Amino acid sequence: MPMQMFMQVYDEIQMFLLEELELKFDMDPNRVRYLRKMMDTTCLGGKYNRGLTVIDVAESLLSDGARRKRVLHDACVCGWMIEFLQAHYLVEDDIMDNSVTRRGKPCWYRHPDVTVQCAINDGLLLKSWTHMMAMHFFADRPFLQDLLCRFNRVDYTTAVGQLYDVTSMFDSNKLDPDVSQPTTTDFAEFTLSNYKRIVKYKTAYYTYLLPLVMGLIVSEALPTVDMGVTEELAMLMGEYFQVQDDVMDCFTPPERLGKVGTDIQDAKCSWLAVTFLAKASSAQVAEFKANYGSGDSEKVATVRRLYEEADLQGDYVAYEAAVAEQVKELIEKLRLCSPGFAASVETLWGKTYKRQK
Amino acid sequence: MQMFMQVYDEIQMFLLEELELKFDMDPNRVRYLRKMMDTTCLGGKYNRGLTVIDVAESLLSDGARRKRVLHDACVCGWMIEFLQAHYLVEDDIMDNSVTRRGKPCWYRHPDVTVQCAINDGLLLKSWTHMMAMHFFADRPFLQDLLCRFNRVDYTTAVGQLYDVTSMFDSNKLDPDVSQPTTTDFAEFTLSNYKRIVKYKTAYYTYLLPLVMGLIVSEALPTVDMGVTEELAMLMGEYFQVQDDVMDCFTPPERLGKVGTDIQDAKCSWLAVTFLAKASSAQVAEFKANYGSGDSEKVATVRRLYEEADLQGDYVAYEAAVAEQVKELIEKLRLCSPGFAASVETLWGKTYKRQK
Numbered sequence: 001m002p003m004q005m006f007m008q009v010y011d012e013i014q015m016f017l018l019e020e021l022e023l024k025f026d027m028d029p030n031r032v033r034y035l036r037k038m039m040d041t042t043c044l045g046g047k048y049n050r051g052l053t054v055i056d057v058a059e060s061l062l063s064d065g066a067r068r069k070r071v072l073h074d075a076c077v078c079g080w081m082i083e084f085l086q087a088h089y090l091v092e093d094d095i096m097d098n099s100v101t102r103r104g105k106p107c108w109y110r111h112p113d114v115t116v117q118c119a120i121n122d123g124l125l126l127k128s129w130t131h132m133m134a135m136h137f138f139a140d141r142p143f144l145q146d147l148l149c150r151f152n153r154v155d156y157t158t159a160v161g162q163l164y165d166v167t168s169m170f171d172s173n174k175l176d177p178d179v180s181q182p183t184t185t186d187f188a189e190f191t192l193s194n195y196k197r198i199v200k201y202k203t204a205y206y207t208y209l210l211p212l213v214m215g216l217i218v219s220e221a222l223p224t225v226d227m228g229v230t231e232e233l234a235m236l237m238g239e240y241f242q243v244q245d246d247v248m249d250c251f252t253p254p255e256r257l258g259k260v261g262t263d264i265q266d267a268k269c270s271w272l273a274v275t276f277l278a279k280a281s282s283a284q285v286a287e288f289k290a291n292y293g294s295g296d297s298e299k300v301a302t303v304r305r306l307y308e309e310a311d312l313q314g315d316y317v318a319y320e321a322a323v324a325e326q327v328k329e330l331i332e333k334l335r336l337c338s339p340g341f342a343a344s345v346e347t348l349w350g351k352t353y354k355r356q357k
Numbered sequence: 358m359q360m361f362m363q364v365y366d367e368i369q370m371f372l373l374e375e376l377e378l379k380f381d382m383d384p385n386r387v388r389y390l391r392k393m394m395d396t397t398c399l400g401g402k403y404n405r406g407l408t409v410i411d412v413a414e415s416l417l418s419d420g421a422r423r424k425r426v427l428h429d430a431c432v433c434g435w436m437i438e439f440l441q442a443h444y445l446v447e448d449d450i451m452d453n454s455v456t457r458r459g460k461p462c463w464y465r466h467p468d469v470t471v472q473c474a475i476n477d478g479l480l481l482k483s484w485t486h487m488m489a490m491h492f493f494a495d496r497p498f499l500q501d502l503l504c505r506f507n508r509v510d511y512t513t514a515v516g517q518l519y520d521v522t523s524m525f526d527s528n529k530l531d532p533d534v535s536q537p538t539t540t541d542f543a544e545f546t547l548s549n550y551k552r553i554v555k556y557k558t559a560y561y562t563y564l565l566p567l568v569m570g571l572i573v574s575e576a577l578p579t580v581d582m583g584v585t586e587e588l589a590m591l592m593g594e595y596f597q598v599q600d601d602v603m604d605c606f607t608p609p610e611r612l613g614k615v616g617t618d619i620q621d622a623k624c625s626w627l628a629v630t631f632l633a634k635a636s637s638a639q640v641a642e643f644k645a646n647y648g649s650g651d652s653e654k655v656a657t658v659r660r661l662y663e664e665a666d667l668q669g670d671y672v673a674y675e676a677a678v679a680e681q682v683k684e685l686i687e688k689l690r691l692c693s694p695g696f697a698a699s700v701e702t703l704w705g706k707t708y709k710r711q712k
């Protein structure tokens with residue numbers, strides 16, 4: 001049922017958006033068709049965990065069936081706002097990361113009939129749609145300003161995180177727009193401290209915090225929860241989520257992952273890289289440095305081999321157990337004053353812990 | 358300019374100070390973003406920003422309230438300037454441009470990667486929302502302001518889609534297929550050109566500064582919005598026509614940017630007007646040489662535009678526009694004399710501009 005209602009609201013959203021373009025933007029049928037395909041390709045096909053979380057949180061906290069109908073419809077719209085914001089980030093990210101596939105299909109910019117220049121702008125259209133749907137459904141809601149204030153702040157935080165992500169292989173000391181420099185050679189910025197910052201801002205806020213907050217807002221329950229503990233939870237689960245993403249990038253097969261990994265080739269400051277460099281022997285580190293950040297098949301294979309030799313999967317399972325311990329504690333802390341909200345956080349945790357995605 | 362530039366400092370201080378305090382940002386990246394902001398937002402003529410101030414001030418015609426409206430207008434002005442900065446960073450990447458305002462394009466700076474530049478463009482747009490909330494959280498006009506600002510942002514992105522898909526047979530548009538640059542150039546019609554330019558340029562360059570000025574001076578309902586939109590679309594079309602002409606005919610030292618329309622096979626005013634008027638042999642030579650980075654092919658296309666006396670047609674198009682602008686400003690002046698005076702000034706910043 002939650003999935004059923006979520007998909008029905010997608011239809012309403014898509015119909016509103018596409019029918020407007022025809023009538024208000026002088027758009028021809030061919031370009032309306034193009035944008036319908038863009039929307040469908042970029043926003044559908046994932047698990048909708050962010051979207052579905054908003055619904056779960058909203059319904060969990062409202063406790064007269066008219067108000068339930070309304071809150072649930074508002075939660076569906078908020079959920080699609082987050083899914084569209086994500087779709088926006090993934091279109092741009094794939095171009096930025098030179099990725100090949102996503103969800104088992106070509107990246108948007110890699111479709112045979114999409115130009116990179118169009119794809120950049122298509123990503124922008126996706127973000128605009130979040131604002132368009134918000135105004136269409138919420139123009140008369142008293143929570144609109146607070147909703148969008150928070151939504152926009154998380155959008156901002158994500159872009160700040162993406163900056164951390166894309167500048168992480170560069171000695172930050174040598175960062176100057178008017179100069180230029182190659183990939184790091186000592187990898188001295190590949191610290192856990194730096195990793196934690198990247199991951200908090202690029203992923204945790206929009207993936208974990210935002211769904212929770214929007215759910216709280218449409219159920220008009222925000223002030224009822226300890227926001228400090230909630231944020232702690234969100235950051236911890238979001239860090240772990242990105243750690244899983246990084247591990248899967250190297251170790252999960254494309255048929256199950258849906259995407260071809262690029263972290264090695266792009267010289268990303270991944271969890272694998274930072275953890276490997278902190279533990280690996282001198283010879284291992286030297287071979288890593290000589291092979292990392294190259295598209296060369298065998299250099300990538302060398303790095304994959306080194307990660308395998310360093311038993312990084314091992315370290316992950318241990319990181320995983322420590323995270324799970326802290327999650328339980330914080331959920332129990334939240335349950336003290338907000339048992340309903342804590343139950344929804346537990347479900348979000350259940351969708352995350354040991355995910356095979 | 359003086360108060361506009363001091364509001365910039367205030368905006369920049371708020372934004373950069375936050376990043377340190379709230380985003381755990383290191384001094385190096387704060388420095389990087391300060392330079393990014395300065396390079397992308399400063400150096401133009403601030404005509405949209407300055408228009409917001411002119412409109413707001415002219416529609417209050419209390420000293421404390423004047424101070425307030427003017428400060429609000431400056432913030433709105435910078436919102437539009439930052440939104441523009443955002444569009445120009447992405448557009449330069451999309452259009453494979455080399456230079457802007459006599460400097461390298463942002464993505465062409467030696468220490469900027471293209472992947473960083475894309476994201477920098479996004480940061481610029483985010484800043485428009487951040488400044489709005491910092492300054493206007495308590496203003497009753499906030500929802501209406503942002504509603505319209507966001508709609509114009511949207512319209513611009515729709516316009517950019519028109520721009521970027523204009524050399525492709527629209528019948529043959531399918532994400533799952535692929536197709537080269539047009540061979541017959543049958544879509545290079547004046548009808549299609551007018552749609553591109555209305556949406557990519559006219560709304561954010563002409564309509565938005567007017568609307569934002571009306572809003573902060575609390576004067577929006579006082580004006581005929583139909584006639585106002587008419588003016589905005591007409592002046593915006595003409596503005597983009599000037600842009601297209603300058604792309605080919607204005608020297609880089611004066612223009613501040615290297616032209617790319619020919620190489621990118623754009624549906625420019627030059628292209629559409631040329632193809633409508635040129636001889637069979639000229640048309641054929643155009644089709645054989647357009648949309649190529651080849652130095653000799655670009656020179657051929659430039660030569661053909663010169664031979665076709667497009668400069669001539671421009672002067673005639675310009676006179677026709679000026680006639681209709683005068684008509685509409687006089688219509689506006691009937692009920693909104695003060696607003697009409699501000700529109701006339703905006704028109705004066707546009708007509709026969711050498712930029």
Ligand SMILES: O=P(O)(O)C(O)(Cc1cccnc1)P(=O)(O)O
Pocket residue numbers: 089090093094097099158162202203245249
């Ligand atoms: O799905 P991807 O590309 O593996 C990723 O998670 C996508 C993404 C984009 C933006 C913010 N957070 C994650 P990345 O971080 O690039 O590894």
Ligand SMILES: O=P(O)(O)C(O)(Cc1cccnc1)P(=O)(O)O
Pocket residue numbers: 444445448449452454513517557558600604
């Ligand atoms: O400044 P430019 O690049 O000549 C231009 O005017 C920039 C621009 C960007 C976005 C919307 N409108 C104009 P373009 O349209 O690409 O010719």
Ligand SMILES: [Mg+2]
Pocket residue numbers: 093094097099
């Ligand atoms: Mg990626």
Ligand SMILES: [Mg+2]
Pocket residue numbers: 093096097165
């Ligand atoms: Mg990425």
Ligand SMILES: [Mg+2]
Pocket residue numbers: 245246249
């Ligand atoms: Mg990844």
Ligand SMILES: [Mg+2]
Pocket residue numbers: 448449452454
């Ligand atoms: Mg351009």
Ligand SMILES: [Mg+2]
Pocket residue numbers: 448452520
């Ligand atoms: Mg352009």
Ligand SMILES: [Mg+2]
Pocket residue numbers: 600601604
């Ligand atoms: Mg141009």
